Design a protein around this ligand. Structure first.
Ligand SMILES: Nc1ncnc2c1ncn2[C@@H]1O[C@H](COP(=O)(O)OP(=O)(O)OC[C@H]2O[C@@H](O)[C@H](O)[C@@H]2O)[C@@H](O)[C@H]1O
Length: 172
């Protein structure tokens, strides 16, 4: 498990790779794969749909059951559910939907959830359907997460831009 390979080390604990998170999970067999969720755990586009489809919809059914008994998450909150065939666990984390005006500062709260796990395979929260700047999401990740986070960025152009922008933010 957790056999990550081919990552660029950004900081002592943050790593990045140009890869699809679903194919990484199959290769790596992680203890925790992170889902970029919404508060009702209705898995639409982006990472949530890809993960769910790879579980043959098991993750959506499990999520419906979780909501029925526990109610919705808060923005910036999380829950641990099964990883099914992709990982031991899936950490469903709700970043702010800044397309809908939600507080971008809640992205720190979202990434703080990573600190409850030794090692995680993760995407950049809020940077897709939720419309946050991917560079900003990476900055919050680097400044917030103290545990080992392996980030999967599937788009090669975005990967290159993120590395490049990281170098500027780091050299000040
Ligand atoms: N298969 C993938 N592999 C790696 N990265 C991916 C993949 N799919 C998307 N990404 C990237 O991961 C980042 C996160 O984007 P989203 O998955 O859209 O997550 P988010 O912006 O937080 O929006 C969450 C919302 O989208 C719905 O899927 C979900 O149900 C929730 O309502 C983006 O940079 C996005 O381009």
């Amino acid at each position: 498990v957790n056999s990550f390979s081919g990552y660029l080390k950004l900081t002592d604990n943050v790593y990045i790779k140009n890869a699809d998170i679903v194919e990484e999970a199959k290769k790596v067999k992680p203890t925790v794969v992170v889902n970029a969720a919404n508060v009702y755990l209705k898995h639409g586009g982006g990472v949530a749909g890809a993960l769910n489809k790879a579980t043959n919809n098991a993750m959506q059914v499990e999520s419906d059951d979780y909501i029925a008994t526990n109610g919705p998450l808060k923005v910036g909150g999380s829950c641990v559910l099964s990883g099914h065939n992709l990982a031991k666990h899936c950490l469903h984390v709700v970043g702010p939907n800044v397309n809908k005006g939600e507080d971008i500062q809640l992205l720190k709260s979202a990434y703080e959830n990573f600190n409850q796990h030794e090692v995680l395979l993760a995407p950049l929260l809020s940077a897709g359907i939720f419309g946050a700047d991917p560079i900003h999401s990476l900055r919050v990740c680097v400044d917030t997460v103290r545990t080992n986070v392996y980030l999967a960025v599937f788009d090669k152009n975005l990967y290159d831009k993120l590395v490049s922008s990281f170098l500027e933010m780091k050299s000040e």
